[PDB]
């Protein structure tokens, strides 16, 4: 058993920085849209509505030459997505 899936919650924070540790630090520190696809598909499942789709689309960017979500972006939107930091 190499991949591991889990359900959401308050420690979905541990999820987002744990996949940040699998995907974003073996050697990348910048995970692109495609990484977000493997991420949200196999690390858990999905979120809700079109704004978590914002997660998925904003990860890349407007042009998308080499835009990726590095050290913080994936947990900062994950923290606002779950708890909301406004």
Among 8, 38, 24, smallest CA distance to 74 is for: 24
Could you say which DSSP state residue 8 is in?
-
Distance (Å, whole) CA 82 – CA 20: 16
Task: Indicate the CATH number for domain 1-86.
Answer: 1.10.238.10
Cβ partners under 8 Å of residue 13, min gap 6: 75, 78, 79, 82
- The residues spanned by each domain of the chain are 1-86
In 3D space, the residue among 85, 7, 83 whose CA is nearest the CA of residue 44 turns out to be: 7
Please check whether residue 78 is in contact with residue 85, taking contact to mean a CB–CB distance below 8 angstroms: no
Say whether 69 sits in a helix, a strand or coil: strand
8 Å CB contact between 81 and 50: no
Q: How far is residue 81's CA from residue 86's CA, in Å, rounded to a whole number?
A: 11
Question: What's the CA gap between 70 and 32, in Å, rounded?
Answer: 8
All residues at 6 or more sequence positions from 77 whose CB lies less than 8 Å from its CB, including other chains: 55, 58, 69
């Amino acid at each position: 058993a190499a991949p591991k899936a889990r359900a959401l919650g308050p420690e979905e924070k541990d999820e987002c920085m744990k996949i940040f540790d699998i995907f974003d630090r073996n050697a990348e520190n910048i995970a692109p849209v495609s990484d977000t696809m493997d991420m949200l598909t196999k690390l858990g499942q999905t979120y809700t509505k079109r704004e978590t789709e914002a997660i998925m689309k904003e990860a890349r960017g407007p042009k998308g030459d080499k835009k990726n979500i590095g050290p913080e972006e994936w947990l900062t939107l994950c923290s606002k997505w779950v708890r909301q930091d406004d």
